[PDB]
Curated annotation (Swiss-Prot):
Gene3D superfamilies: 2.60.120.200. This is Lectin. Glycans are attached at N17, N113. Keywords: Calcium, Glycoprotein, Lectin, Signal. Binds one manganese (or another transition metal) ion and one calcium ion. Belongs to the leguminous lectin family. PANTHER family: CONCANAVALIN A-LIKE LECTIN FAMILY PROTEIN, LECTIN.
Amino acid sequence: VETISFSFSEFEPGNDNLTLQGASLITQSGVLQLTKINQNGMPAWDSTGRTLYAKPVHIWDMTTGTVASFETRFSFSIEQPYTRPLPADGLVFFMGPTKSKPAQGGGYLGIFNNSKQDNSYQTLGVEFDTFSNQWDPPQVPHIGIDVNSIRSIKTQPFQLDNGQVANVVIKYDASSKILHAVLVYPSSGAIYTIAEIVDVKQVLPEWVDVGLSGATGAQRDAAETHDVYSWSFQASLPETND
Ligand SMILES: [Ca+2]
Ligand SMILES: [Mn+2]
């Protein structure tokens, strides 16, 4: 079994296991800030940032025809200092082609270029969307499963516990092809669950980059924080199948 796993209970500046892109920054306090925060202490608008694990992950093998099962857990907080103008856009856990660079920001969350459904994206993502774009359901925020498109195949509305820490668990079982995600707010005890069938062999390339991406709106003050406090990941690829 080909396995890979990493666990960051805290983030350390200079850690070569993580690749920071765009506005993403690791603070001295050990927090990963995906989007920029100005010196005045308020979140910056028109900011996009991503963090990728420095090594590619083997998700499926064509020779043996096996597919990896995986699980990721992370804690984040989104603080919306203002109710107006409307806060944007969110953050997302994604898997896509290796050597990927940031895509469009704003509602595309840094991983897509348009709102079209395109196989060439070869990207899977689980978003936490805070702004309702034209391709979105009216309710925000919402959890969404994105498969080669910013237009989710399935969404689940949730209530934001402003500025509080949320715990997320995303698990993929290769045997059943079920991607199930859970979001829990310890502060309020709220629990949200969402699941869908995803055939990763049909969507993703054999080796992928895994990461987190966040973005703020293009309108002045259409922003919020996208802070990550911890992140762990594990994948197991059966080397054979007899
Ligand atoms: Ca959106
Ligand atoms: Mn959405």
